[PDB]
Subunit: 79 residues, 3 copies
């Protein structure tokens, strides 16, 4: 009670990634989407229990700003 | 911000993504949708139990702002 | 109001990475998204209990700015 800071949590209980699975847990901010300023300091709270990815799965648990950070179509993957 | 507690949670119980599936669990904000939205403490509350994606599925569990973040349409065919 | 302690934690309880799996725990800042801060652009709080990746898996637990740090963009069948 009585807060002036950031509020809005995303939570996960269990995560299982198997086989060619990539998971981003937390936050991804693309440059274009948001860079400082008097931006948001309040976000929607999401909470998941168990999440499993099987077979080339891409899973992002958290907040993606922009929509080019974790997911994409086809780029120059050189590593 | 100074709003005491944000109300509006999304909750997921079980998630299974199988086979080339992509899942966004959380909140996606496109740039266009929210830059200087410095106060959002009353949103929609959605709870789901089990969600399964099978075979090249896109699934977003959470909030999508802009409608362009996770479900980025075919914008880059040149890639 | 008067803050020195930032509110916005990414927490993890247990992590298991096996077989060519790589995990980034903390924060990954690429130069492009922001260099050395510039406000708190993002400090969204995420909390996960147990996360397991098995089999050449990529798991990032925390915040990725830029999307060029721990991973880069890939070649996936269907966007």
């Amino acid at each position: 009670m009585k807060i002036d800071a950031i509020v809005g949590r995303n939570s996960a209980k269990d995560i299982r990634t198997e086989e060619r699975a990539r998971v981003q847990l937390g936050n991804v901010v693309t440059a274009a989407a948001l860079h400082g300023g008097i931006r948001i300091s309040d976000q929607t709270t999401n909470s998941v229990e168990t999440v499993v990815g099987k077979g080339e799965s891409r899973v992002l648990i958290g907040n993606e700003y922009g929509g080019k950070g974790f997911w994409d179509n086809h780029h120059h993957h050189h590593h």
